């Protein structure tokens, strides 16, 4: 428990770009957090990068203007970033910093929260194993959500992603709660962020939902703290708490933009496409908040979305976040142009965890080799169509009819689908059962003879 | 009129309950003013003089 | 004496007043004791990386030297268990603490001081012989499945003095004295050595026996071998770590020392979960395979300075068990990881850079690292001949192969297994690019196929260039449709695309596939190629006739007998014997000869 008054000073060694180095401070702290006054009557505030003999460098959270090297002051809290946070959070929505702007009182902190989170020990974390059912054909049936899993949206610039991130958070549920929904927005449209209030008040779950914002408009640089803060919230309502809580950010790709910003204002080591050459750690800093634990019942769920800066896979942001994740769902512009309101291309959309939360007990023994034949014949009907591009209509043979017609068949009722509706389980696996007896008996081999011989007819 | 009058009964009851919960509120409040003024009075009372554990001679 | 913190920045820290310090020495740093190593000098300074995350360090504060490098313990008590990137029992901190984090600066024994061992001195052990190092001096039954030995670490040498009797004992009690020229010492059964120290052998020797993968693919076609290496590249998705699960689950060697660095750790959780359930059959007694297993984890999330010190420890517990008289295999995730840490501390050194912003020294480590592989006749007098195996696994950003970090491997490996994205597209699950795969191990293993397989021989040759011949003309089918080749080109297109659906194919996750014996692909490769010669022969004789076999014909002829031929790989290695699978291998044979032969 701190009690010393804090220390004063006016040593403005210097400014460059972003960054703010200061003279003759007593035993500065790493990770220090500032304030400061301008000239004028505002406030701002900074964080420690690193320190050297006497001299200590800071950076702005929002950005540095008009400092003066005469007249500002600092002020040393002698800590490290640490937010307020309480259980009545919920049902309140903040900007940046947590500063209220559904006009209500300051946060009463029920705790006060280290932001950099501690790393969880392996050995006592538990597998996840549950099924969360979505009431969407092409995830629950060819994919799977499970409590805990960290997921991410792949989408692209005017795709329609929002609404599919609405759909999910609107009627999640468990095959056979709660859903306390944490929306962090990292530099996004107004439009979007009215759209997803509106969403959730038509929902009727405002009791349940906490809110962070920041428009394109706020500084840049606090993006980099936005959703951190927003992450500590949901753990603290995790694990102190044991609530379900289901987490949504809106834009990596504008939090690796900051992150790019702030290395290359200090000239640090650069990789693949003027990258930071350590985005990797802090990417995986971010994700690998999930997972429950042991002896607790709650449980954490991540669903972010990022956005590929055109149709390329190999750009940086999605091949790492690749790396780090467990899957991904794909969204592909093809389908957005035929106007299938689910722009779900099945075949890039692999997700990691269909071993444990499907088979006997969960749904059925069928449902994983169903999901694989129909990976294989989707697959056969790209590439007959792709021959067919070739080789013209009548050069082709009863199998790539067969192949074709499987293809229209199930892009016309396995993925299409209403926006409001609400699939279970066994109807996809019945449509898929649909799906699969337009083939013969004898050209299903992903199937084994035991299943058929019992499902097939 | 069914709406309008329904909502105008649900404006009442969360009008009666909040009103309810902030009485019952300052009810907790009156009750555990002074200890918790003490605490904060003797804390500030209190200095534990020293020097930073990094000072060299 | 005692060094003062100069300046922080990042997992780097400068520290003065360090004049008696020397490079790769272990230091504390902080308030709490954050372990670390020094990597620069210059005059009174000095530099250190920290293996704990740096956040509320002031300057000034103090910093403790000690001359010891970094090394682990070594001793009982290590399988089962799983520990951080430098050695630091993770079941007991837990356990300790009674918490879910880990604290910032924990300090606990590497291994248990309160569990007892028994123990058999050795049956020549006499007072006042000479062991000179090497030599095992007891026995000590650490599991039901293997059997931890003790012996005298090397550089060591004297006359026996004290001998333990048979009894138990805990840690550090004294085991055996050892008097050389008038200085006594004494030891126990647990010791110490530097990390980035190559333990001496007594000679390096060839590999002789094949080390199978329990894969139809690896085995039959990129086999690998016994005290080799190899390495794993491919984008992300293509179950790289499916496949170390399999080696680690299905080995043939004893101890399987499984080094994850920079992933999920999920993937450690699986690891926890499934492995004490399944059992193996060896000694005719089942055991949980954890005991033949030692876990060794480093989450992404963890600080970047304890990558590198995680590869190192892993290697050392596998060479202090190469010595010990088995046969190991490594399981070594991602190394790519341990370059970028090295890209990032090279950062921070405002070092200069070489290609794609690695240090120029990144060659250098990998060789040093993996050059330790190999056979091994080991030191001692009781010989024993032991081995170990290194299966590294590398993740290129982007899904090429123009990084120079592999670029560097494969100038290293022997083996080299391609992943290729598009086939775990296909749910071709097992994804290995055959066209660009290869393996340099195919001499000094002919002998073992002579002498236990010897038809295997030619047959793989023929799959191969089957398989060649139908990527020669797969171009040319794809430019210009059907219609315009031979028979006989249909036919070899035909089966090798049966080939690729079902002998390729192995879904690893059915539990009448998880495993495949050897013979088991023997047989499968046998039918295959007597079927496919079979067809090629009786059509080419009937290339002059008055009617001419197409493949329409045949397919008419066999549809039923080709549904059976890819059905084959439905035969579970247990609950259905040897004998009853080779029967029908040979009755399915014995069908294709009466249908060839009756047309």
Redesign the interface.
């Known amino acids: 428990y701190l009690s010393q008054p804090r220390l004063t000073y006016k040593t403005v060694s210097g400014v460059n770009g972003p960054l703010v180095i200061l003279d003759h401070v007593k035993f500065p702290r790493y990770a220090e957090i500032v304030h400061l006054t301008l000239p004028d009557g505002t406030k701002r505030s900074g964080q420690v990068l690193e320190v050297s003999g006497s001299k200590a460098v800071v950076q702005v959270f929002e950005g540095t203007s008009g400092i003066d090297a005469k007249k500002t002051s600092c002020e040393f809290t002698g800590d490290i970033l640490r937010t307020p946070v309480s259980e009545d959070m919920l049902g309140r929505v903040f900007n940046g910093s947590g500063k209220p702007i559904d006009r209500g009182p300051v946060v009463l902190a029920e705790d006060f929260l280290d932001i950099m989170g501690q790393p969880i020990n392996p050995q006592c974390r538990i597998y996840p194993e549950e099924m969360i059912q979505t009431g969407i054909s092409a995830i629950d049936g060819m994919n799977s959500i499970a409590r805990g899993q960290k997921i991410p949206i792949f989408s692209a610039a005017g795709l329609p992603h929002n609404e599919i991130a609405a759909q999910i958070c609107r009627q999640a549920g468990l095959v056979k709660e709660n859903f306390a929904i944490v929306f962090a927005a990292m530099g996004v449209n107004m439009e979007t962020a009215r759209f997803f209030k509106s969403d959730f008040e038509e929902n009727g779950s405002m009791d349940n939902v906490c809110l962070f914002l920041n428009l394109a408009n706020d500084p840049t640089i606090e993006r980099i703290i936005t959703p951190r803060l927003a992450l500590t919230t949901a753990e603290f309502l995790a694990y102190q708490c044991e609530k379900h809580v289901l987490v949504i950010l809106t834009d990596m790709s504008s939090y690796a933009e900051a992150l790019r910003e702030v290395s290359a204002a200090r000239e640090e080591v650069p990789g693949r496409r003027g990258f930071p050459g350590y985005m990797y750690t802090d990417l995986a800093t971010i994700y690998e908040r999930a997972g429950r634990v042991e002896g607790r019942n709650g449980s954490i769920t991540q669903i972010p979305i990022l956005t590929m800066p055109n149709d390329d896979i190999t750009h940086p942001i999605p091949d790492l976040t690749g790396y780090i994740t467990e899957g991904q769902i794909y969204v592909d512009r093809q389908l957005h142009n035929r106007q299938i309101y689910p722009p779900i291309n099945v075949l890039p959309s692999l997700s990691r965890l269909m071993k444990s939360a499907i088979g006997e007990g969960m749904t059925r023994k069928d449902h994983a080799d169903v999901s694989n034949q129909l990976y294989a014949c989707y697959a056969i009907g790209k590439d007959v169509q792709a021959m067919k591009a070739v080789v013209g209509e009548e050069a082709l043979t009863s199998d790539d009819l067969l192949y074709l017609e499987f293809l229209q068949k199930f892009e016309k009722n396995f993925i299409t689908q209403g926006p409001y509706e609400n699939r279970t389980v066994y109807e996809t696996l019945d449509i898929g059962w649909q799906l699969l007896r337009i083939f013969p008996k004898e050209m299903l081999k992903r199937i084994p003879q035991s299943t058929l011989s019992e499902f097939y007819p | 009129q069914a709406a309008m009058g329904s909502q105008g009964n649900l404006s009442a009851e969360v009008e009666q309950a909040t009103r309810r919960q902030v009485q019952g509120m300052q009810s907790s409040q009156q009750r555990n003013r002074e200890r918790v003024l003490a605490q904060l009075l003797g804390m500030v009372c209190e200095v534990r003089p020293q020097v930073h554990p990094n000072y060299r001679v | 004496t005692f060094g003062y913190v100069?300046?922080?920045?990042?997992p780097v820290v400068?520290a003065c007043d360090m004049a008696g310090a020397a490079m790769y020495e272990l230091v504390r740093v902080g308030?709490s004791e954050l372990v670390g190593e020094i990597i620069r000098l210059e005059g009174d300074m000095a530099t250190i990386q920290v293996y704990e995350?740096?956040?509320?360090?002031?300057?000034?504060?103090p910093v403790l030297r000690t001359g010891k490098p970094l090394s682990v313990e070594l001793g009982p008590g290590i399988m089962g268990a799983?520990f951080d990137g430098i050695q630091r029992p993770?079941?007991d901190?837990?356990s300790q603490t009674q918490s879910?984090?880990?604290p910032r600066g924990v300090n606990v024994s590497a291994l248990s001081r309160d569990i007892k061992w028994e123990f058999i001195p050795s049956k020549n052990l006499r007072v006042g012989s000479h062991i000179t190092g090497g030599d095992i001096y007891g026995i000590v039954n650490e599991n039901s499945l293997i059997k931890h030995k003790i012996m005298l670490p090397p550089r060591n040498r004297g006359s026996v003095t004290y001998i333990a009797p048979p009894g138990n004992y805990d840690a550090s009690d004294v085991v055996l004295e050892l008097e050389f020229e008038g200085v006594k010492e004494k030891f126990s059964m647990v010791q110490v050595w530097p990390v980035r120290q190559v333990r001496p052998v007594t000679e390096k020797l060839p590999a002789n026996h094949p080390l199978l993968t329990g894969q139809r693919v690896l085995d039959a076609l990129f086999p690998c071998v016994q005290g080799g290496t190899t390495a794993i590249p491919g984008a992300?998705?293509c179950g790289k770590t499916v496949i170390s699960q399999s080696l680690s689950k299905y080995s043939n060697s004893d101890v399987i020392i499984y080094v994850g660095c920079?992933e999920?750790?999920?993937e450690?959780?699986?690891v926890?979960?499934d492995f004490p359930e399944l059992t193996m059959e060896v000694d005719g007694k089942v055991e949980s395979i954890m005991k033949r297993t030692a876990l060794v984890?480093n989450?992404?999330?963890?600080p970047?300075a304890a990558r590198e010190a995680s590869i190192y420890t892993g290697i050392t517990l596998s060479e202090y068990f190469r010595d010990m008289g088995y046969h190991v295999s490594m399981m070594a995730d991602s190394t790519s990881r341990w370059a970028?840490a090295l890209?990032?501390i090279?950062?921070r050194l405002a070092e200069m850079?070489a290609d794609?912003?690695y240090p120029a020294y990144l060659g250098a480590r990998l060789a040093s690292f993996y050059e330790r592989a190999g056979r091994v006749k080991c030191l001692g007098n009781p010989e024993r001949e032991g081995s170990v195996s290194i299966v590294g696994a590398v993740?290129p950003?982007?899904?090429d192969f123009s990084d120079p970090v592999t670029s560097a491997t494969l100038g290293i490996v022997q083996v080299f297994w391609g992943l290729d994205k598009k086939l775990?597209?296909?749910?071709h699950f097992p994804s290995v690019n055959w066209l660009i795969s290869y393996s340099k191990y195919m001499r000094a293993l002919d002998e073992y196929y002579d002498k236990h397989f010897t038809e295997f021989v030619p047959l793989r040759t023929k799959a191969k260039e089957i398989l060649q011949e139908e990527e020669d003309l797969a171009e040319i089918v794809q430019l210009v449709?059907?219609?315009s080749l031979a028979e006989t080109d249909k036919i070899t297109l035909e089966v090798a695309k049966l080939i690729k659906?079902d002998f390729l194919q192995q879904?690893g996750?059915?539990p009448y596939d998880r495993f495949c014996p050897f013979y088991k692909t023997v047989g499968m490769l046998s039918n295959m190629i007597s079927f496919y010669d079979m067809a090629r022969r009786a059509v080419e004789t009937t290339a002059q006739s008055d009617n001419k076999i197409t493949w329409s014909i045949i397919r008419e002829h066999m549809?039923e007998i080709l549904?059976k031929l890819?059905?084959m790989k439905?035969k579970d290695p247990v609950k259905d014997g040897e004998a009853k699978i080779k029967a029908d291998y040979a009755q399915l044979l014995e069908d294709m000869q009466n249908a060839f032969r009756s047309l």
């Open positions: 100069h300046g922080v920045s990042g400068t308030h995350e740096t956040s509320g360090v002031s300057v000034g504060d799983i993770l079941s901190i837990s879910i984090y880990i992300f998705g920079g999920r750790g999920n450690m959780s699986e926890l979960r984890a989450t992404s999330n963890m970047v970028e890209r990032e090279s950062g850079p794609s912003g993740s950003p982007g899904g775990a597209q296909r749910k449709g059907k219609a659906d879904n996750y059915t549809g549904y890819s059905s439905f």
